[PDB]
């Protein structure tokens, strides 16, 4: 189940603007909406990445809400200020950014929770 969705994958060094906003719930909402528009892209979480983003790093984690093994890499939209949790984990599949033409190197599919 869930909706299937794709995004581009951009370099954090081309993505001049990696903030959707400057609070958690802001960036989470705007992310959901830049996804709804389709003007979002993905940035992979690597060791030097957080202290180049703004702050409310809109993460994707592989849906810790289930107990089954048989599926695609499903994820869900989440956000943290210091990246206290999630970003500093191995769940976590990247951080979203507003796509402004930064030239992708790749694309990253996921599914997207839709209750009804």
Swiss-Prot record:
Residues 1-116 form the CoV Nsp1 globular domain. It comes from the Viruses. Inhibits host translation by interacting with the 40S ribosomal subunit. The nsp1-40S ribosome complex further induces an endonucleolytic cleavage near the 5'UTR of host mRNAs, targeting them for degradation. Viral mRNAs are not susceptible to nsp1-mediated endonucleolytic RNA cleavage thanks to the presence of a 5'-end leader sequence and are therefore protected from degradation. By suppressing host gene expression, nsp1 facilitates efficient viral gene expression in infected cells and evasion from host immune response. May disrupt nuclear pore function by binding and displacing host NUP93. This is Host translation inhibitor nsp1. The lineage of its organism: Viruses, Riboviria, Orthornavirae, Pisuviricota, Pisoniviricetes. The gene is rep. The chain holds residues 12 to 127 of 7073 of the full protein.
């Amino acid at each position: 189940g869930h909706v299937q969705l794709s995004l581009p994958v951009l370099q954090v060094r081309d993505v001049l603007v990696r903030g959707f906003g400057d609070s958690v719930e802001e960036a989470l909402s705007e992310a959901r909406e830049h996804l709804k528009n389709g003007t979002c892209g993905l940035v992979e979480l690597e060791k030097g990445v957080l202290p180049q983003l703004e702050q409310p790093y809109v993460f994707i984690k592989r849906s810790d809400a289930l107990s089954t093994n048989h599926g695609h890499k499903v994820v869900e939209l989440v956000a943290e200020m210091d990246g206290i949790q999630y970003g500093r984990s191995g769940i976590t599949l990247g951080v979203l950014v507003p796509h402004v033409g930064e030239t992708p190197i790749a694309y990253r599919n996921v599914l997207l929770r839709k209750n009804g």
